[PDB]
Design a protein around this nucleic acid. Structure first.
Ligand SMILES: [Mg+2]
Ligand SMILES: [Zn+2]
Ligand SMILES: [Zn+2]
Lengths: 1358, 49, 79, 98, 50
DNA sequence: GCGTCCTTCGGAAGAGATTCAGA
DNA sequence: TCTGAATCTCTTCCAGCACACATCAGGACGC
RNA sequence: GAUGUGUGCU
């Protein structure tokens, strides 16, 4: 049919070609017999007939007159459907300006003529004249003349000189423009001028002129002459109940425009005075402006109720526009909706539909089978029989509903598992029964939520629902390798209560020959479910190549585990149920069942776990009483100790030792420590305090308190909720993220005061107002993440390269948060990995390492695997299967032709939204850690201190004087095992090389107020610190000691902003001291809030504190407050203080001194040395005048900006930095996201690449073009005798890179529809319909999944 | 908001330097607003409606 | 009598080509008069197609060679 | 609530919204990603081309369903033609190539 | 009459429903004793004393 | 009952236009 | 006095689905 | 058909 969409400007000849008539009167339906008016916005002569195959006046009535045009009213008799296809047009008496090319910012008229926007809007809205054809005078071709100046110009130069005004003047300016001469003149100016800002402006105007001269467009078409009208059927005036009509916005706007045009034409026909026609031209221009894009001008007009009405742009742009409301998503027939109930008698491939919903859903199917069997005769007879709900219809419904899967769907569909396909089971009632095993995936609690059903009509839809979207084949979440059908909240409790032991029973020491006799014992009640017996079991093993070899043993187990073994499929080792099965235990059990056996045994076993959990949970009676939450008898001692310590803090801050912010930072510290102590004390008292006799003296066992069962099993609960049920509730947070200074001291089991409840109200409102008002900026994240990765789809089997990111197991301050196994699993290695059996390879070059390979890598203790990443793939418009890895939902390599960009974006974007609508579940607790200020190393081994600049203290111990340090603990083998981050100004009791014993303390510091320290001792002189101007100095009269606080750049005096406080070190003679290594003075700069408690010229020791600066480490650190960081990383925001790097290698030295600020020059020893850099005096330099620096080394300190790290350290370093930071952010809240999705997003970041030099390619010098195009052009040129064009990868944010996508329809549908549509119309772009959203809008097979083969056939056919 | 005079702060996020401004508001029961405010250059600028 | 299609995917390992070939087979079987190679047990045509997939006596190769043979014999039948 | 073939909107040829009106559920913008994620293209194409949007294919599919022939013949969504007309109502020329 | 779910007590911290359940059980026990003492007709002294 | 008509109040960020300073 | 860096100013964006109720559609002025 | 208010689940 078609394979492209072209967008360009509209010519008046082309609009008249679109035009079928000339509307010139604002007459809608005549408030009478409802006929269209003669020459109004609705008319049969202009657009088309009202009723089908009928004339307007009534001269023809049926199809036998089709084609003829009537005589009395001049209308044609044709279909009535063409009223939404046949456009009219308006012949404006005077031209007008189209605002989209006027106020886009960049204003196309503004930079096309190089005259500012203000002058153009003054000219186009009649406040000043403008000059055309200056001629033989001093007036230029673009000069602006006011009224008085224009009058002067006419009284002195009233010759053939012309000076028009308004839209006519602008039209003359654009028509009298020569594109080639301007283009070559600007090219000459670009070649001549050396300044960069004028160069950028000139090259932007050159780009615009090249866009004009390339396409068939011309500059004069941007001023509107004829105004086409929308077809009447798309602006209907529905006849309401009575004589009034609908207040359709477009009709009123067209009425106003036609009013202005007709009045202007009448005034121009009568030769009105020039001021009146000028004012009426202004009115016409503003009316057309309000019709085209209302609200872009100063005031948006309103029709009624003082409400800004919508124009032709408000229904194309925004959240309520056609792109997001009626194109990317539509209301769908054959659908239903009802409240859901449990019905746990179902299976994974079954759902429950109400008997009445299925009769309305599958109604055409019933009609078809009723016509097939001959029970009915025609369609209307079957319709009447269905409406009468005869008994035969109910019988035949069970026939159509048999194996026709439906789409169960919830309202918020966060991820891929929001739509699953089930077979229906017809039941009575009006509720959609749902299988609870998928309720965790759905996040569909049974508290009154509505799900939506959908009926696959065509054959392919049913087969896709059977083979792809079926819930049986969706038991692995796309986020990670963990299963998504995890039993929860009843089955976990049942299994945990069953698979448990206590030392007593009805029968304990007896012996059984298998699970069957254990069941016989438990059913008869001759042995308790928690006995400790020795049954004889027959577990199977598959050591052979797919054959199960038998073995029989006599293991010491319980009765419950023996019963549970009856449902375990043949092939798993018995050492999976011989414990207390919690939630993670059975999750791992299901995972290993899937990994070993497959899919059908896994689903059958999951259903069996469901059944045997529900039955033995019903039989358990695991209730909850008020006698189950036991209050520990030592929590009030802990609150007394914390009260004493905070009373000490009172004296600490009121004296002046610490300030208000520091007091607030320490009080939260001590309250959190007390809360963590009370929680642990209560947990111990509630899990171990039970007494039982084994037929003799008393023995201790794991407690059987109900709350402990449902807090240890993990069915539903954690430490927070139960901790708040007994003992200490803790300290809660305000909606802004700040934490309350006073934690309420009471628990819900004993009660709350009338004031502690008021305090907990803060956290309770925080949770709710955080969910409902900050899940918006987390749904926005996933929206603009799915947008940026929609067009990325697997396209090739193998790209065949050797490039790949370097993969290491990360230890960022604690234990091993994630090992190698959890990190590299299911990803194809990039090269032959070297085991520590060196000179021999362990795993081949291109094997997708599965769980067995992961175990092999864990066995040989390998710590450095080069793995293929999706960001380093070499394919074109997609990524090969080998650079991605496994499907993450199936146990195999991914199939070529699958949309992984969408599953990556959804996986990244819905832990944030999900968990931010979960912060109210724990109540309102801050959940802030204790902020430990010491290092207790546990493992035995040595220390490898990397990049540490330590100095000697007055006590002699090492003190760190660097910011990027990390203390790594490495065991005796030499492999890395631990790594801790020591802070600035921390003292070390140990060093490097010494084998540190396990269980000592090596580093100490103070958590708040990290101190600036000195290298060399001596006397300090108070330089550039005068009281009041830049420092607030307070002094006690009696003692006479200065404890000052410095000012910021905020509250300091405006004149004194050039005064920068610092402490300079001098000797006894006041001479200059030097840093060890260089001859530069010790100028230690002071930041804001720096407190100093010293005196000028005091004797100190080397390596001591000088000043303290508060850190203000305050925040709840939830996913609600704590994830703008992910948005900053993905949109690539430049940090406030970027740490300057070394852009080229070579020796480092200074050049000129104080060119306003410091200067530095890097010179290589072989190549050219044109690199200079500007260094503000804010940051000290970690390098000196006499070392050698390499590319990527940090000259100063601070956060890295995700532009320079890419441009200097390469793609791998920046992608690893982004991956690590996002992974740490998500793992702070326990989320487990596979890194592949993040790498997919980072690859989608890097699509733009600016050209360094043209080379032999056809691209320009500074033009920014797709990296895929550059790679293809370079590969094509390298096949010939030419040379490729050197480039550099850019890094634009997800929003920036999405808005500059090659297919303009995606960007137009996403955001800034006006600014993108105008650019696409100016440039004359041509969409290829390559991605997914474009084919969604068009309505074809998306080239993503099952339609990928069809798209390949359609592409290769041409 | 009760009619009267209100001395708002607009602390923080303005001027990208932390420089606290100070704006005085006189909200009438029925009439025009009389917003006084400062400037980053320590100028006191009035702004009505 | 159908719960999952894992065996069928093990037969043809694409998970997407399977849907297309099953759709083609069921379209042949439903609107036309082509008889199933496996005796149906009062099931919808989709799972008869899938059951033909899993026993291995059908694929894209078998279907298009059979269709080419049928086209050849019907065009030769005109004589 | 449930909905077979029924009433349709006027400005766009889509099913109505609500329960008082015999209207169907909304397979919204977030819903389509959940189908592109699976790769189930044909079912998505029915949910926004032949089942809701278009006019000729809407009746053709109904006839096919009550004829024993489960097959879909997609045309063009009417809501896309609405977008084309509303863009051409401006000074912009959007069109379909050959 | 109603078989609820115990796990709705701890995770959503509405412990007051357990205390309401206990107090309602006590109230219905007192009502049941009153009903029993009223079923077989005893003099007003016993009912007033209870 | 007909019938025709001419208030302010968000805020986080990006971009494009001014001002500053500074050598 | 030209030209980068800083600041001023204008625009864009802000979750999804569903349900219920109400009003409203020129309303002012002449006939 | 659009606005206004209230409400449910996230
Ligand atoms: Mg819920
Ligand atoms: Zn006629
Ligand atoms: Zn690749």
């Amino acid at each position: 049919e078609f394979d492209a969409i072209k967008i360009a400007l509209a010519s008046p000849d082309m609009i008249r070609s679109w035009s079928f008539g000339e509307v010139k009167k604002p007459e809608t339906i005549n408030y009478r017999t409802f006929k269209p008016e003669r020459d109004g916005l609705f008319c049969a002569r202009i657009f088309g007939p009202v009723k089908d195959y009928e004339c307007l006046c009534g001269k023809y009535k049926r199809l036998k007159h089709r084609g003829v045009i009537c005589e009395k009213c001049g209308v044609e008799v044709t279909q009535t459907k063409v009223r939404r296809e046949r456009m009219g047009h308006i012949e404006l008496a005077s031209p007008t300006a189209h605002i989209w090319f006027l106020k886009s910012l960049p204003s196309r008229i503004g930079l096309l003529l190089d005259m500012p926007l203000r002058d153009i809007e003054r000219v186009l809205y009649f406040e000043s004249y403008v000059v055309i054809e200056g001629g033989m005078t001093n007036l230029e071709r673009q000069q602006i003349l006011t009224e008085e100046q224009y009058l002067d110009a006419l009284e002195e130069f009233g010759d053939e000189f012309d000076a028009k005004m308004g839209a006519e003047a602008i039209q003359a300016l654009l028509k009298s423009m020569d594109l080639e001469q301007e283009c070559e003149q600007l090219r000459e100016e670009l070649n001549e001028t050396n300044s960069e800002t004028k160069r950028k402006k000139l090259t932007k105007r050159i780009k615009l002129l090249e866009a004009f001269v390339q396409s068939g467009n011309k500059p004069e078409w941007m001023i509107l002459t004829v105004l086409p009208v929308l077809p009447p059927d798309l602006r209907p005036l529905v006849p309401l109940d009575g004589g009034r009509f609908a207040t359709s916005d477009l009709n009123d706007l067209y009425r106003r425009v036609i009013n202005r045009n007709n009045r202007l034409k009448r005034l121009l026909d009568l030769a009105a005075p020039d001021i009146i026609v000028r004012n009426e031209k202004r009115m016409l221009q503003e009316a057309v402006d309000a019709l085209l894009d209302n609200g872009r001008r100063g005031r948006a007009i309103t029709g009624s109720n003082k409400r800004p009405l919508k124009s032709l742009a408000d229904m194309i742009k925004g959240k309520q526009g056609r792109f997001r409301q009626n194109l990317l998503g539509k209301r769908v027939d054959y659908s239903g909706r009802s409240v859901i109930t449990v019905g746990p008698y179902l299976r994974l491939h079954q759902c429950g539909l109400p008997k009445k919903m299925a009769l309305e859903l599958f109604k055409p199917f019933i009609y078809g089978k009723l016509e097939l069997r001959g029970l009915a005769t025609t369609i209307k007879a079957a319709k009447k029989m269905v409406e009468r709900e005869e008994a035969v219809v109910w019988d035949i419904l069970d026939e159509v509903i048999r194996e026709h899967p439906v789409l169960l769907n919830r309202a918020p569909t966060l991820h891929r598992l929001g739509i699953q396909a089930f077979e229906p089971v017809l039941i009575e009632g009006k509720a959609i029964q749902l299988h609870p095993l998928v309720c965790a995936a759905y996040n569909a609690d049974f508290d009154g939520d509505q799900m939506a059903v959908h009926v696959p009509l065509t054959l392919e839809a049913q087969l896709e629902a059977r083979a792809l979207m079926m819930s049986t084949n969706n038991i692995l979440s796309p986020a990670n390798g963990e299963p998504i059908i995890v039993p929860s909240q009843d089955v976990v409790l049942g299994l945990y209560y069953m698979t448990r032991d206590c030392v007593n029973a009805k029968g304990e020491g007896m012996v059984l020959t298998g699970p069957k006799e254990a069941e016989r014992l438990y059913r008869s009640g001759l042995a308790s479910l928690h006995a400790r017996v020795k049954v004889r079991i027959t577990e199977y093993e598959k050591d052979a190549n797919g054959e199960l070899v038998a073995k029989t043993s006599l293991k010491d187990t319980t009765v419950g585990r023996a019963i549970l073994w009856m449902i375990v499929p043949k092939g798993l080792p018995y050492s999976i149920v011989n414990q207390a099965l919690g939630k993670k235990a059975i999750s791992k059990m299901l995972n290993t069942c899937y990994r070993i056996l497959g899919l059908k045994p896994t689903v059958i076993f999951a259903d069996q776990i469901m059944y045997t959990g529900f039955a033995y949970a019903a039989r358990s009676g695991a209730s909850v009483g008020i006698d189950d939450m036991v209050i520990p008898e030592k929590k009030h001692e802990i609150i007394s100790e914390a009260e004493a310590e905070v009373a000490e803090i009172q004296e600490q801050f009121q004296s002046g030792l610490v300030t208000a912010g520091e007091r607030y930072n320490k009080v939260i510290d001590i309250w959190a420590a007390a809360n963590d102590r009370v929680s642990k004390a209560m947990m111990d008292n509630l899990q171990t305090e039970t007494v039982i006799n084994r037929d003799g003296q008393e023995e201790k066992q794991v407690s059987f308190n109900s709350i402990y069962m449902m807090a240890d099993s993990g069915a539903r609960g954690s430490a927070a909720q139960i901790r708040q049920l007994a003992g200490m509730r803790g300290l809660m947070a305000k909606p802004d993220g700040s934490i309350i200074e006073t934690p309420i001291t009471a628990n819900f089991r004993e009660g709350l005061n009338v004031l502690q409840y008021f305090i907990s109200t803060h956290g309770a409102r925080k949770g709710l107002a955080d969910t409902a008002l900050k899940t918006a900026n987390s749904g926005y994240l996933t929206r603009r993440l799915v947008d940026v990765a929609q067009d990325l789809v697997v396209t090739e089997d193998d790209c065949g390269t050797h490039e790949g990111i370097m993969m290491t197991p990360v230890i960022e301050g604690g234990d091993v948060k994630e090992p190698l196994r959890d990190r590299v699993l299911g990803r194809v290695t990039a090269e032959d990995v070297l085991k520590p059996g060196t000179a021999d390879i362990l795993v081949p070059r291109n094997t997708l390492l599965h769980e067995q390979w992961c175990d092999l890598l864990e066995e040989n203790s390998v710590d450095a695997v080069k793995v293929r990443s999706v960001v380093s793939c070499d394919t074109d418009f997609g990524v090969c299967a080998h650079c991605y890895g496994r499907d993450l939902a199936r146990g195999h390599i991914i199939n070529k032709g699958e949309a992984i960009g969408v599953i990556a974006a959804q996986s990244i974007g819905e832990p944030g939204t999900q968990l931010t609508m979960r912060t109210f579940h724990i109540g309102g607790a801050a959940s802030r850690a204790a902020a430990e200020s010491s290092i207790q190393v546990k493992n035995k081994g040595s220390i490898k201190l990397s990049n540490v600049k330590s100095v000697v203290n007055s006590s002699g111990k090492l003190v760190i004087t660097s910011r990027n340090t990390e203390l790594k603990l490495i065991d005796e083998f030499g492999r890395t095992k631990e790594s801790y981050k020591v802070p600035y100004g921390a003292v070390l009791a140990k060093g490097d090389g010494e084998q540190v014993a396990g269980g000592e303390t090596v580093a100490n510091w103070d958590p708040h107020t990290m101190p600036v320290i000195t290298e060399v001792s001596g006397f300090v002189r108070f330089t550039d610190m005068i009281d009041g101007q830049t420092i607030t100095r307070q002094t006690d009269e009696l003692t006479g000691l200065s404890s000052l606080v410095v000012l910021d750049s905020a509250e300091r005096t405006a004149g004194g902003k050039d005064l920068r406080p610092a402490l300079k070190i001098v000797d006894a003679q006041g001479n200059d001291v030097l840093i060890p290594g260089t001859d530069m003075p010790a100028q230690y700069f002071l930041p804001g809030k720096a407190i100093v408690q010293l005196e000028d010229g005091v004797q100190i020791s080397s390596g001591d504190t000088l000043a303290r600066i508060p850190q203000e480490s305050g925040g709840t650190k939830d996913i609600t407050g704590g994830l703008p960081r992910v948005a900053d990383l993905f949109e690539a925001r430049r940090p406030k203080e970027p740490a300057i790097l070394a852009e080229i290698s070579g020796i480092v030295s200074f050049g000129k001194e104080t060119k306003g600020k410091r200067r530095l020059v890097i010179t290589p020893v072989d190549g050219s040395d044109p690199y200079e850099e500007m260094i503000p005096k804010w940051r000290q330099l970690n390098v000196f005048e006499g070392e050698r620096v390499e590319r990527g080394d940090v000259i100063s300190d601070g956060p890295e900006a995700p532009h320079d790290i890419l441009r200097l350290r390469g793609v791998h370093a920046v992608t690893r930095y982004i991956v690590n930071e996002v992974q740490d952010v998500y793992r702070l809240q326990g989320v487990k996201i596979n890194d592949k999705h993040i790498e997919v997003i980072v690859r989608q970041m890097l699509r733009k690449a600016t050209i360094v030099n043209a080379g032999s390619s056809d691209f320009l010098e500074g033009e920014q073009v797709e990296y895929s195009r550059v790679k293809i052009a370079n590969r094509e040129l390298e096949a010939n005798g030419k040379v490729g064009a050197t480039y550099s990868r850019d890094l634009l944010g997800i929003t920036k890179a999405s808005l500059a996508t090659e297919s303009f329809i995606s960007a137009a549908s996403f955001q800034e529809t006006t600014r993108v549509l105008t650019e696409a119309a100016v440039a004359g772009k041509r969409d290829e319909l390559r991605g997914l959203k474009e084919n969604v809008i068009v309505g074809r097979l998306i080239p993503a999944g099952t339609g990928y083969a069809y798209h390949q056939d359609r592409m290769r056919r041409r | 908001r009760s009619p009267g005079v209100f001395f708002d702060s607009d602390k923080g996020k303005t001027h990208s330097s932390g420089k606290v401004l100070y704006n005085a508001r006189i909200i009438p029961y029925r009439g025009s607003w009389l917003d006084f405010e400062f400037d980053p250059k320590d100028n006191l600028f009035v702004r009505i409606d | 009598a159908r719960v999952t299609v894992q065996d069928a995917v093990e037969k043809i390992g694409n998970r997407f080509d399977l849907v297309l070939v099953a759709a083609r087979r069921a379209r042949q079987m439903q609107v036309g008069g082509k008889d199933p190679l496996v005796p149906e047990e009062n099931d919808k045509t989709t799972v008869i197609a899938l059951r033909e997939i899993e026993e291995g006596l059908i694929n894209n190769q078998i279907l298009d060679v059979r269709e080419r043979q049928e086209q050849q014999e019907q065009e030769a039948a005109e004589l | 609530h449930a909905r077979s073939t029924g009433s349709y909107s006027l400005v766009t040829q889509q099913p109505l919204g609500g329960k008082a009106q015999f209207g169907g559920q909304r397979f919204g913008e977030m819903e389509v990603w959940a189908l592109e994620a699976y790769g189930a293209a044909y079912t998505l194409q029915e949910m926004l081309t032949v089942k809701s949007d278009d006019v000729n294919g809407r009746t053709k599919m109904y006839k096919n369903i009550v004829d024993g022939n489960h097959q879909m013949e997609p045309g063009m969504p009417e809501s896309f033609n609405v977008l084309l007309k509303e863009i051409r109502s401006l000074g912009i020329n959007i069109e379909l190539e050959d | 009459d109603i078989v609820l779910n115990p796990l709705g007590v701890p995770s959503r911290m509405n412990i007051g429903q357990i205390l309401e359940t206990h107090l309602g059980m006590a109230a219905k026990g007192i009502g049941d004793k009153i009903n029993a003492m009223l079923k077989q007709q005893q003099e007003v002294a016993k009912l007033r004393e209870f």
